[PDB]
Subunit: 336 residues, 3 copies
């Protein structure tokens, strides 16, 4: 690419949507390389994360935890306008694991309250990748305050199985998983603070135990359950992108599988197949492809079941369609 060629490329503005939903995109790329433009506004705000009204001073790309999923194709350029409003109190930046150089972009995007920056990078490697804020000297605090998200760099040809056959999903969800480290007082009750900075020393004491107090999808216990369950129909092909910026996880679809799982997140490494539970190390995204076969409620968990059912790491899928008694049947229903 010449200087002539790079400036000549199409620009395309893309509006983000909140997770677990993903902005519209084409799986197979349309036309040649382009510069895909995205804007995100940073919000520091108090969120409630559990049923006892536990508060976090969230630090949120686009106001959500996780940050939204950005979608591009291989050798496109991602050009992000990152804005830190005058209402915030901390400097922030962004590290895309999908980018090369300057600490993922962190070294170039350090913006105080009241400033903006525009970073462009070439998306040379196909896959799902974490991005997170990373101010020097304070990185784990920003990240565990929920300032992280993911992107997906689709291959220009869309996705393929290990023998090169097309894998085309009908829909795509993004589950961002968050470990929170909320300080308690002597009596075991979670503390509240006036400004984010007040909580700093207390939170580090918690971080250093390496034991989160909460492990949550979409920013809170139960954000993806009940009426906010994810949805599919028997016969639909669903891609579930899962990210964890700081800590290991082990996703599992209770009553399903991952028919094809890029556990490492990278689309040039052939997927694993038929998975019960896959493993995503902290600081990575992964993706699982699954065709639903049975209707009903499913759970989708971090299969450390303490983390899933005590600490908040559980979602639902609501699936419509016809039951298949060949796959499974109750021969004799509970009886005595």
């Amino acid at each position: 690419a010449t200087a002539a060629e790079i400036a000549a490329l199409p620009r395309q503005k893309v509006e983000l949507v909140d997770p677990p939903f993903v902005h519209a995109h084409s799986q197979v790329a349309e036309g040649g390389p382009k510069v895909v433009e995205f804007t995100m506004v940073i919000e520091e705000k108090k969120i409630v994360i559990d049923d006892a009204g536990t508060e976090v001073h969230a630090m949120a790309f686009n106001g959500t935890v996780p940050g939204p999923l950005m979608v591009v194709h291989q050798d496109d350029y991602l050009e992000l306008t990152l804005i830190n409003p005058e209402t915030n109190t901390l400097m922030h930046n962004i590290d895309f694991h999908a980018a090369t150089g300057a600490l993922g972009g962190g070294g170039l995007t350090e913006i105080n309250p009241g400033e903006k920056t525009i970073l462009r990078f070439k998306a040379t490697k196909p896959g799902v990748f974490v991005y997170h804020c990373a101010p020097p000297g304070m990185v784990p605090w920003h990240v565990v305050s929920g300032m992280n998200g993911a992107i997906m760099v689709l291959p220009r040809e869309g996705l393929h199985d290990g023998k090169g056959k097309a894998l085309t999903y009908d829909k795509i969800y993004y589950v961002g998983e968050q470990d929170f480290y909320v300080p308690r007082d002597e009596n075991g009750k979670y503390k509240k603070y006036e400004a984010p900075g007040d909580a700093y020393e207390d939170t580090v004491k918690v971080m250093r135990t390496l034991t989160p107090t909460h492990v949550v999808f979409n920013g809170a216990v139960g954000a993806l359950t009940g009426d906010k369950a994810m949805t599919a129909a028997v016969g639909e092909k669903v891609l579930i992108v899962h990210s964890q910026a700081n800590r290991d996880t082990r996703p599992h679809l209770i009553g399903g599988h991952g028919d094809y799982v890029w556990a490492t997140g990278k689309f040039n490494t052939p997927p694993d197949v038929d998975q019960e539970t896959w493993f995503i190390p902290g600081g990575a995204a992964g993706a699982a492809f699954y065709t639903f076969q049975q209707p009903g409620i499913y759970a989708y968990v971090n299969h450390n079941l303490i983390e899933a059912f005590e600490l908040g790491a559980a979602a639902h899928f609501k699936v419509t369609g016809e039951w298949n008694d060949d796959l499974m049947t109750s021969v004799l229903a509970p009886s005595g």
Copy 2:
């Protein structure tokens, strides 16, 4: 579904881990209905030499529950019994199964009930099963109410390149994280009912730090009378599961020649593994040919977990020492 009753049926006799019931690696015929029965026992098990107890919630009376073996596309039909002398509702989630929370949504049985579930084993590999009563899921799992099944390919095991892999022995290591409450003196507490230990146990669990990490339900379980045996030249498959917590198996003195670390037989295996990794909520399988005789240890390779918390087993291998592979050129002696 109508034609399942036309298929051959087979009642299996289960055996206690680490042994695996009789079966053929290559499928003997077209799809069958393979039938199993398991009675759930709520019981006290002693987990270390200090007499620490757990309120075990045990499939077939053992932690882990026994290993069921079927072939891809057979139906596994389980009769699961919750005796009237038990206190809790229980059920079964097979990770191998498709629909209704792996069967959990169809098998909730109160003390004094049975149920029979059937599922088509459509995917080849080793899979976790475990109890999953809504509202108290990890309590049941970390009380030892979990096991595994193996769904062999119809044509048996192969490597990545299509070469048949055929074992002489198979063992099943179920690894258990336990969360035993302690008193003010750091003494493990004892209780008289599963229910009475609940909240104390929940508090230990939320620390995410097991007080014990054991094979076959106890420190030293898989040693001495339950040491696993082989001879130089024999090909052994070591099925390993952990229903709730990561492990990193390692055979001390050997390797995993072929490891399906994810547990799934259509994923080509890793080769020449020193230490492999099985995530909480999965099973994996490691294939090795013994080359050297002696006692081997087999460990979770967080060695604090192996050697302080209980996660070590032994293999006992007969045969001829091979000096090409390894020899002591100078025995330990003065400088």
Copy 3:
């Protein structure tokens, strides 16, 4: 196979170098199998592990933590002279994960202070592998006192990708990662002890929490930073061997990737590609191959970021060469 055949093979004595450097070696085997001779003296020694001057009685192969990387080729023999000086206080041995029998050699190498031993084993399996001391009854305590290292058994034809094309590195680093469990007093300050034995009971308590006090590269917090930073240039192909004898890790090059990663560390298992963060279980070594594309400072971390930036698991690369604006550019600098 036979004693005669073994005796007839050429001998080669090799001098070890201190990590993170690796002794001279050739990627493609020069000639046929030989018996490669190494000598390591065990030193029980005081080491400092942070800027606060926290002190550990290390049990160091060759006097370094990790012990040095030994490099052989597949079906060479490795013949280690192990020496335990009369001045030491404990029995030690060596378990090579690369070796077959008698617990990796631990069974044959138990040496009291004032004794030495010579173990020979045949290097049958290509990959990087942990070695560590393992005295029956005090195995973990030796290992998390720093008594561990790695070896690389290269294929005779050198490294290849999954599809049989040669991968030749320009340089190699060995990053040994250590978890330490350092006892604290009633007011949370780290303790000192007069002999290794004095630290025993207190350390065991910290160990059983499974929460390390420090997580470090090359023996100490910041050991691979400043003027000890690893270095490279744009265009340069770097292999990074990373080991962890006791505890998982999830290595990440900040601003970079793992182009080819043998996450399991074994060269007959095809590498993952395009990795953002890879995973190395406790008890293993792994290797990542990367071509630097951009100049500047990188950090190379365990991507549990609390472990990286609170507990010490972060190293730097200094990289010289020309900035590539096509790969990344700051379209708009922080402003407003």
